Amino acid sequence: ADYQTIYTQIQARGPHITVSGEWGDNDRVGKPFYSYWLGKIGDAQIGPIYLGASGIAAFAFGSTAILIILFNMAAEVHFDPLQFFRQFFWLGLYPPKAQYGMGIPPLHDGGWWLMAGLFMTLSLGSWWIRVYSRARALGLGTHIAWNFAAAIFFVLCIGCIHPTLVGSWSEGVPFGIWPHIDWLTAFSIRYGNFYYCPWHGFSIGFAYGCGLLFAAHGATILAVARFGGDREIEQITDRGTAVERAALFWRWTIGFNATIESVHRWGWFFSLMVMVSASVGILLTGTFVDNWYLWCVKHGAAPDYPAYLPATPDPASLPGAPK
């Protein structure tokens, strides 16, 4: 077996490299240090970190959002520190419970939620600028930023775009561990079972495919690490036996194959499509479809099944039944 694919047997140390960027080389703070146990399964060097304007703006806005959330959470346990740790998972900051439409809600019923939403959104935009500009500063393409953009766009969809399209802030995602989980069922119940939303299906198809692709790609590179397949950039520009064997393994298995470069386009595309499909689904939901199951029945797609115990009429529609 190739033990190098499991962990680094003999680690190496050397002077720390610094690639210069078009700006901000002085905003790298911290002194690098080395972790021997990290170095078994990764690169041993931790830090320094770049510390630009957008990154600080992100930390500023983020912490503001975190603080607004934590304070409202603590209010929910009347500031008892012990119950706060006990009940942490169950605590939350909720959008309005009452229907104000799109009017700004009272602070006690969703205003603080809206506030925390604003500052998180600013934090996401600020970090996006960091992710984008750091690439151009180092003379790299902006591929990560465009993937990250789709992920931010999906959050905005469930956070505020879908609420504004249907016209009620009551539909946003709460802040908190269990409560953001509870939203998923409330939403799916409201809109007629999300299994029958084709864009749920698409998103899941791509999410599962990301698991398929990264398992397959990761396994492939490790299987050709003896020929240096991990050095992918130079295998793109000068095809070595590593990527020839990787390409032929798949070709002989499934009948076709990618290149060392194109496999990353596949992976990038699949990842992006998780978020793009999710967003189309949310954008259609509530605006143009009210019950995804009935929409599938309307178009003849839903499965049906025999009764097992007897079919049961809606009692509310029998004559003389109470309301």
Binding site: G92, V289, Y305, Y308
Partner: protein
Amino acid sequence: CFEPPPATTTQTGFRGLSMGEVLHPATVKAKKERDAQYPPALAAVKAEGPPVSQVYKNVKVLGNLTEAEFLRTMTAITEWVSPQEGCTYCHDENNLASEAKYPYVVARRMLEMTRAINTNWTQHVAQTGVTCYTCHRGTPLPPYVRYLEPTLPLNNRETPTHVERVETRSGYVVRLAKYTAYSALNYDPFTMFLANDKRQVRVVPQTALPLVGVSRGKERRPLSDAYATFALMMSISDSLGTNCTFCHNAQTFESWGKKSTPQRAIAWWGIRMVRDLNMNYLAPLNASLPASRLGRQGEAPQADCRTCHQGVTKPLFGASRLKDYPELGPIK
């Protein structure tokens, strides 16, 4: 952390749909033994003599019974409601027609309520019916009642923690969670849905596309109604010791016909019956109760699904005393 196998499972939908009950035998046995404490029927007595309307002085509900029949009732009532306290719980030792103790007047209304249940709500209690025991289980205060705010523990026979106490505000989220099967849902399904008939449980649209005029802005129900319905369903499931598939094919929670079991219809009647009981029999009794029975808003204790069911899909696993005590209903 975990419950050792095997599990008992049942089937409630077409094969391949994963519908049905999942039960831990130990737990079922412990509930079976708790419920087997149901006292057996007192021996039948011969109907003899005049109606007790002519014999006793203050008999307004049970007036058509004979003396032995009526005293048999009174023995059964004491066994079901106040066995440890005895007949003197409701009566003055020296004047059995005195209404001076509040349990007397309450018991009279409870008699009317119980026969109402067995006569007007057969759509829910069928031929099984209820007795005083179904709720009370041998104590004057039933172990599973609800106030207009959640209380812990669920069984009022256990002693509350400082945090469990309703006046400790830091314990509200936990009081609420334990009523909704430990979910973080931020809604009290009892005051929302079971205390009165003001709210609609259904939230799911019955059309594929959104209907213009109910689908935008303030025309829309807030999403919180869906959280609230879900919370009601968590609470209902936990109260019967069962899961959603007992009543629903989760393919379409809102559909009836093949998508619902007959138990879902019975449950629907149960919601209406509990509303009738609370609005018309139990909530008015804050006039007749001491202040130590009332909640922080002067409300009487009221009933939910757990009051009768106590964690079993049929109260007391289907035990019945209807044929043994005709005077409790149904009434022609």
